[PDB]
Design an enzyme around this catalytic site. Structure first.
Site, mmCIF file in Angstrom:
data_model
loop_
_atom_site.group_PDB
_atom_site.id
_atom_site.type_symbol
_atom_site.label_atom_id
_atom_site.label_comp_id
_atom_site.label_asym_id
_atom_site.label_seq_id
_atom_site.Cartn_x
_atom_site.Cartn_y
_atom_site.Cartn_z
ATOM 1 N N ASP A 406 24.189 31.306 31.556
ATOM 2 C CA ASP A 406 23.628 32.449 30.842
ATOM 3 C C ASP A 406 22.097 32.315 30.839
ATOM 4 O OD1 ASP A 406 24.184 34.830 29.102
ATOM 5 O OD2 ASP A 406 23.116 33.610 27.602
ATOM 6 N N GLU A 435 22.181 34.339 36.040
ATOM 7 C CA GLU A 435 21.249 35.455 36.039
ATOM 8 C C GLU A 435 19.819 34.918 35.999
ATOM 9 O OE1 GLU A 435 22.567 36.036 31.302
ATOM 10 O OE2 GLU A 435 22.482 37.775 32.631
HETATM 11 O O1 LIG Z 1 23.693 37.684 15.934
HETATM 12 C C1 LIG Z 1 22.623 37.158 16.709
HETATM 13 C C2 LIG Z 1 22.096 38.183 17.705
HETATM 14 O O2 LIG Z 1 23.181 39.102 17.985
HETATM 15 C C3 LIG Z 1 22.869 40.134 18.926
HETATM 16 O O3 LIG Z 1 22.574 39.633 20.201
HETATM 17 C C4 LIG Z 1 23.666 39.670 21.137
HETATM 18 C C5 LIG Z 1 23.443 40.794 22.148
HETATM 19 O O4 LIG Z 1 23.327 42.039 21.473
HETATM 20 C C6 LIG Z 1 24.616 40.832 23.136
HETATM 21 O O5 LIG Z 1 24.370 41.819 24.128
HETATM 22 C C7 LIG Z 1 24.802 39.459 23.813
HETATM 23 O O6 LIG Z 1 23.796 39.256 24.770
HETATM 24 C C8 LIG Z 1 24.016 38.194 25.728
HETATM 25 C C9 LIG Z 1 24.555 38.781 27.055
HETATM 26 O O7 LIG Z 1 25.847 39.335 26.858
HETATM 27 C C10 LIG Z 1 24.627 37.685 28.123
HETATM 28 O O8 LIG Z 1 25.058 38.224 29.366
HETATM 29 C C11 LIG Z 1 23.244 37.054 28.274
HETATM 30 O O9 LIG Z 1 22.315 38.026 28.618
HETATM 31 O O10 LIG Z 1 22.846 36.466 27.026
HETATM 32 C C12 LIG Z 1 22.688 37.444 25.974
HETATM 33 C C13 LIG Z 1 22.176 36.705 24.745
HETATM 34 O O11 LIG Z 1 22.154 35.300 24.954
HETATM 35 O O12 LIG Z 1 24.874 38.408 22.838
HETATM 36 C C14 LIG Z 1 23.761 38.352 21.908
HETATM 37 C C15 LIG Z 1 23.963 37.135 21.020
HETATM 38 O O13 LIG Z 1 25.104 37.287 20.190
HETATM 39 C C16 LIG Z 1 21.699 40.979 18.413
HETATM 40 O O14 LIG Z 1 21.370 41.975 19.372
HETATM 41 C C17 LIG Z 1 20.484 40.079 18.147
HETATM 42 O O15 LIG Z 1 19.423 40.852 17.593
HETATM 43 C C18 LIG Z 1 20.867 38.945 17.182
HETATM 44 O O16 LIG Z 1 19.773 38.048 17.037
#
Ligand SMILES: OC[C@H]1O[C@H](O[C@H]2[C@H](O)[C@@H](O)[C@@H](O[C@H]3[C@H](O)[C@@H](O)[C@@H](O)O[C@@H]3CO)O[C@@H]2CO)[C@H](O)[C@@H](O)[C@@H]1O
Ligand SMILES: OC[C@H]1O[C@H](O[C@H]2[C@H](O)[C@@H](O)[C@@H](O)O[C@@H]2CO)[C@H](O)[C@@H](O)[C@@H]1O
Ligand SMILES: [Ca+2]
Length: 712
Positions: A406, A435
């Site tokens: 990730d 990625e």
């Molecule tokens: O609760 C903590 C955090 O939650 C939310 O973040 C999430 C994203 O909204 C969600 O899309 C997902 O993102 C991950 C992708 O799916 C993955 O492919 C790669 O790009 O890593 C991303 C994050 O590491 O997961 C996150 C984390 O749960 C919310 O939007 C944040 O503001 C909040 O801090």
């Protein structure tokens, strides 16, 4: 925040520099000279510079001897006042890293006779291990400091089943935390647990995987996969559901394990299975989460197990699931999250060695290149050690077949090449990719493991978003369209992708070799292909949309490189228009086995394309040089693309193969490059039973793909 009452402050910001901060209305009282004291110690401190702040006056002092960590230090002012030496930025210096890097094993080392506990806390002054057990008397023992800032203690007896916590004293404040290397934890991961080896045996030996372009990846989430009422599986949304054999839907269609095997996929990529936050393991149905909120990197998630209260259970079930897939010829890829942790302030890393494990900006504040609060500093020596230790552990103890990193772009190149070395030695042939987006994190651009630096990371793959957008259309502008949707402006970029993305005409290469290009059009992120297309083409009926999505699959499945498929894509998976479903309910995220039923025919088309790729190596050239010698473009227009594979003697079973992709509903005629008779293997309707022969010209009616071949 309540706090320890102190006269003034003092921090160690470097191996030999102490920063003293005195409160404004004390500047004339607490004055220099200053002195650093400890048991059997008392040296002088020279002042290199001094200047005022807005609430304090500051001194940047120097010492003749390097501070010695592990013992409590005192800073004395001429007025007699004193204060305890606190931790500064010295932890992020190379000198600190080189002095304390430890190469041995850390965590809880078990033996029926006794258990040894070890934790790395170079800047602390004391440490202890806290033991508890339901109805069995709790005990807490002081650990002894050894070389390289490691604390340890040996406890006599059989500790199987015992819960444990570490108590680390930093800046005179004791903190409680679970072991970073904990391999078992209690419900919701409140404490770690000691367990004797489970003696799990792997009974489905698989030889090293031949080559990356020979794989077909299928991405899925453990709860999504079998939670639907009609999944035909008993253990709905659990580790054990994928172990159930010959399962089927209500109407008799194949499902679960039997289904994945029928499709022809080689690797199953799972979303995060290490313990995460977001779902109450005591009441799992009350919430949903993808799993990108790391709590414990060395232990499994509890909500996917039959019983999350018994520490060993979740381990046993994840391993059985993995072993079973192996028995059926299927491999496993683990999605891993080494770029950040959930809630940095309460994380094991931060409570053991404050400020060491996270990157900071020039102001002394945590960076946020990940966009979720913190960035793990992979470049620190013990962090790099941790990441490599973790990757090898899952390979050795869970016997998986590869990893999907990730936000690969956040990690540093040296750390990635270091773990690659150890992982391929432990398991030859595993798949390693991720990625490599360009992200704003404090590292020189040439040190990031991003796509731009692919040449320096051979053996490592990257998601090809260039090819993705060329086929589907820009994913950040809902209404934008790609070749498959009717936009001719991106036909050339598509041809480039069909050629492996390693250079074409005046187009610069995306990656050096095809084995580094993960070709896809859908994933768990953003709108599904069906939903995006539904927003970009509001006036097209369902029949035409279906044909365009099947078209997007043929383009990817018949392209040079490594094909990747999102679970449910084969049957036009939809999420009701939701763009980021990370925490949406089951009705939105579940894999709809009712729809898999309705479109069994379209699923069959995907199954046949996968079979074709497998039966003909011509679609799987091993290098950019070979592609240059057997693949050539023949026609390239706004809605029509035609290329051919030739000179396939030692290579393929067929002599010549021609593929035509049409992206418009009209009907047209296409001239073959010769007058020899060919076999019509496929057209916009689908594959043909017993191929017919055509000459000089062929018809291209409506949206779809036509494949012609010449046998030997
Ligand atoms: O609760 C903590 C955090 O939650 C939310 O973040 C999430 C994203 O909204 C969600 O899309 C997902 O993102 C991950 C992708 O799916 C993955 O492919 C790669 O790009 O890593 C991303 C994050 O590491 O997961 C996150 C984390 O749960 C919310 O939007 C944040 O503001 C909040 O801090
Ligand atoms: O029962 C402990 C552990 O044993 C196995 O792991 C071994 C591995 O097979 C060896 O190659 C080496 O790395 O030592 C490991 C631990 O001793 C199982 O693979 C694992 O499931 C099991 O927990
Ligand atoms: Ca959890």
């Amino acid at each position: 925040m309540v706090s320890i009452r102190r006269s003034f402050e003092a921090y160690v910001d470097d191996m030999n520099i102490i920063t003293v901060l005195i409160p404004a209305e004390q500047k004339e009282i607490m004055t220099p000279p200053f002195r650093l004291e400890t048991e059997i110690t008392d040296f002088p401190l020279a002042v290199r510079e001094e200047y005022s702040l807005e609430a304090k006056y500051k001194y940047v002092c120097v010492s003749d001897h390097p501070v010695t960590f592990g013992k409590i230090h005192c800073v004395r002012a001429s007025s007699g006042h004193k204060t305890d030496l606190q931790i500064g930025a010295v932890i992020r210096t190379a000198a600190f890293d080189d002095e304390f890097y430890y190469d041995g094993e850390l965590g809880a080392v078990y033996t029926a006779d006794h258990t040894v506990f070890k934790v790395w806390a170079p800047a602390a002054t004391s440490a202890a291990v806290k033991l508890s057990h339901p109805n069995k008397s709790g005990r807490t023992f002081q650990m002894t400091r050894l070389e390289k800032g490691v604390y340890a203690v040996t406890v006599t007896g059989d500790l199987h089943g015992y819960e444990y916590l570490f108590c680390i004293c930093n800046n005179s404040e004791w903190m409680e935390t679970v072991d970073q290397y904990a391999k078992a934890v209690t419900v919701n991961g409140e404490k770690g647990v000691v367990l004797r080896p489970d003696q799990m045996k792997w009974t489905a030996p698989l030889k090293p995987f031949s080559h990356p372009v020979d794989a077909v990846i299928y991405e899925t989430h453990l709860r999504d996969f079998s939670i639907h009422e009609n999944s035909g599986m008993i253990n709905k949304g659990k580790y054990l559901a994928l172990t159930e054999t010959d399962t089927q839907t209500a109407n008799g269609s194949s499902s679960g394990l039997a289904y994945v095997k029928e499709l022809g996929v080689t690797h199953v990529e799972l979303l995060p299975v290490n313990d995460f936050a977001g779902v109450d393991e005591e009441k799992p149905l009350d919430a949903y989460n993808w799993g990108y909120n790391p709590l414990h990197f060395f232990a499994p998630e509890g909500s996917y197990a039959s019983n999350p209260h018994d520490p060993q259970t979740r381990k046993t079930e994840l391993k059985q699931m993995i072993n079973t897939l192996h028995q059926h010829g299927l491999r496993v890829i683990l999605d891993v999250v080494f770029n950040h942790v959930y809630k940095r302030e309460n994380s094991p890393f931060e409570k053991t060695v404050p400020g060491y494990f996270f990157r900071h900006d020039e102001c002394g504040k945590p960076s946020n290149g990940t966009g979720v609060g913190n960035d793990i500093a992979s470049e620190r020596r013990m962090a790099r050690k941790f990441i490599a230790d973790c990757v090898v552990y899952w390979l050795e103890e869970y016997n998986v077949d590869g990893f999907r990193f990730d936000l690969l772009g956040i990690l540093d190149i040296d750390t990635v090449l270091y773990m690659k070395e150890k992982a391929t030695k432990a398991k030859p042939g595993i798949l390693l990719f991720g990625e490599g987006w360009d992200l704003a994190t404090p590292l020189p651009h040439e040190q990031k493991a991003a796509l731009a630096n692919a040449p320096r990371m051979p053996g490592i793959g990257f998601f090809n978003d260039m090819f993705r957008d060329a086929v589907k259309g820009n994913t950040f502008h809902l209404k934008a369209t790609g070749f498959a949707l009717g936009n001719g402006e991106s036909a050339q970029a598509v041809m480039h992708g069909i050629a492996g993305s390693s250079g074409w005409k005046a187009l610069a290469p995306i990656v050096p070799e095809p084995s580094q290009s993960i070709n896809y059009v859908e994933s768990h992120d953003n709108h599904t292909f069906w939903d995006k297309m539904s927003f970009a083409l509001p006036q097209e009926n369902d029949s035409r949309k279906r044909s365009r999505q099947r078209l997007a699959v043929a383009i990817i499945l018949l392209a040079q490189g490594v094909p990747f498929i999102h679970s449910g894509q084969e049957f036009f998976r939809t999420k009701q228009g939701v763009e980021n479903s990370y925490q949406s309910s089951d009705s939105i995220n579940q894999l709809d086995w009712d729809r898999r039923e309705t479109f069994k025919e379209d699923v069959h088309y995907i199954r046949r394309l996968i079979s074709l790729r497998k039966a003909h190596p011509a679609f799987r050239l091993r290098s950019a040089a070979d592609i240059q010698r057997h693949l050539e473009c023949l026609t390239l227009k706004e809605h029509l693309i035609a290329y051919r594979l030739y000179d396939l003697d030692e290579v393929d079973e067929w002599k010549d193969i021609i593929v035509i992709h049409h992206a418009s509903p009209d009907s047209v005629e296409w001239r073959l490059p010769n007058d020899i008779p060919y076999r019509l293997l496929c057209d916009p309707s689908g594959f043909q039973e017993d191929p017919t022969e055509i000459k000089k010209t062929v018809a291209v009616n409506g949206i779809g793909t036509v494949i012609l071949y010449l046998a030997s």
